[PDB]
Design a protein around this ligand. Structure first.
Ligand SMILES: [Zn+2]
Ligand SMILES: [Zn+2]
Ligand SMILES: [Zn+2]
Ligand SMILES: [Zn+2]
Ligand SMILES: [Zn+2]
Ligand SMILES: [Zn+2]
Ligand SMILES: [Zn+2]
Ligand SMILES: [Zn+2]
Length: 375
């Protein structure tokens, strides 16, 4: 049988296999081809990572399919993308400052309780304590929590990523992982970060991103729900630098195709070619840059020749759906929570304990940063 191999591409190169073919041997063609050990390698298909031991005869793979290869005590409400030194998603620390003097001296009567309170500007107000400062506006920002950071060293919040405190199973793999990305669709479907990586990467390869006419290219819920397009495109940074970069070039790749052009299939080049005629024979001349001089067939994208050329389970998706009082730990007097805010103030004048809903401890700066609120 013939198998189509896609790794960091839109197209697949054909590999001769059969029913008796094992998986490990196939990643090894790629492993030497890419100098990357198969052991830190995965290949998923139609929503399934078929184990080393499964073969084509023990799965739904049929002749001429195409597959994808990738290379592989503290409550955290917030996750950021850290532009460095981390260059990855990390747990974050919430912070607030005076909208006027930009100092960390702004006191809030009530703390924030939802994402809107901290992403929507001018949403909350307080009093600044800084000497001779009348500033009232609350400016929220996030910082990477994986190392010390200057207060000017901010990071974008990945606001669809949630602490998996409810222990909801992943929509695609059915495992309980932490943290998870929860879509803004109707049923609010939950997906773990690994399956979200595989989802985006697969969609990249198949050129299946949705063009939101208003703002850029995105993806919706993996179940295909309506009104679920990701609006905070920084979420795609979970792809990691190379793939995210490839994601940013999506629009530029779209223009290349619409200009009737074809892309050089060589991964070290990947130039956008706009040849004059539509002849099957194509030579890479680099477009505006320098070409690799590859001559290929425009149809199969193989070296130029003379002849011819050669997902989500309902049960899992029902499971993976995201959706009043405690007694004061010091004085044991019941009190009701103000939505998502974790900052609890007991009204009993004798007790007057400020405490964290989640931790049950005295209120403190660590609890503000880690989980001032939760969803
Ligand atoms: Zn960091
Ligand atoms: Zn101020
Ligand atoms: Zn998963
Ligand atoms: Zn959904
Ligand atoms: Zn080229
Ligand atoms: Zn051909
Ligand atoms: Zn109390
Ligand atoms: Zn806490």
């Amino acid at each position: 049988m013939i198998v189509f191999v896609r790794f960091n591409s839109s197209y697949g190169f054909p590999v001769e296999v059969d029913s008796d073919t094992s998986i490990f041997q196939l990643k090894e063609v790629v492993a030497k081809r890419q100098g990357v050990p198969a052991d830190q390698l995965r290949v998923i298909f139609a929503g399934k990572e078929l184990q080393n031991h499964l073969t084509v005869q023990n799965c739904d793979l049929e002749q001429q399919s195409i597959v994808h290869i990738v290379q592989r005590p503290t409550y955290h409400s917030f996750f950021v993308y850290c532009k460095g030194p981390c260059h990855k998603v990390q747990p974050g620390k919430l912070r607030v400052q005076c909208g006027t003097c930009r100092q960390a001296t702004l006191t809030l009567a009530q703390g924030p309780s939802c994402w809107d309170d901290v992403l929507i500007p001018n949403r909350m107000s307080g009093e600044c304590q800084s000497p001779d400062c009348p500033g009232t506006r609350a400016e929220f920002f996030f910082k990477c929590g994986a190392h010390p950071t200057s207060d000017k060293d901010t990071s974008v919040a990945l606001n669809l990523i949630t602490n998996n405190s409810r222990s909801i199973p992943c929509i695609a793999c059915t495992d309980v992982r932490n943290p998870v990305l929860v879509f803004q669709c109707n049923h609010r479907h939950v997906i773990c970060l690994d399956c979200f990586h595989l989802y985006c990467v697969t969609r990249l390869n198949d050129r299946q991103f949705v063009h939101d006419a208003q703002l850029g290219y995105s993806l919706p819920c993996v179940a295909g729900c309506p009104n679920s397009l990701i609006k905070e495109l920084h979420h795609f940074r979970i792809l990691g630098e190379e793939q995210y970069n490839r994601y940013q070039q999506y629009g530029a790749e779209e223009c290349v195709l619409q200009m009737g052009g074809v892309l050089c299939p060589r991964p070290g080049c990947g130039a956008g070619l706009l040849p004059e005629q539509g002849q099957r024979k194509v030579t890479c001349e680099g477009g505006n840059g320098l070409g690799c001089g590859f001559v290929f067939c425009r149809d199969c994208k193989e070296a130029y020749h003379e002849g011819e050329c050669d997902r989500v389970d309902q049960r899992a998706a029902e499971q993976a759906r995201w959706e009043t009082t405690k007694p004061c730990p010091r004085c044991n007097v019941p009190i009701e929570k103000n939505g998502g805010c974790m900052h609890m103030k007991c009204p009993q004048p004798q007790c007057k304990l400020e405490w964290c809903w989640n931790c049950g401890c005295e209120w403190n700066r660590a609890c503000m940063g880690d989980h001032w609120f939760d969803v």
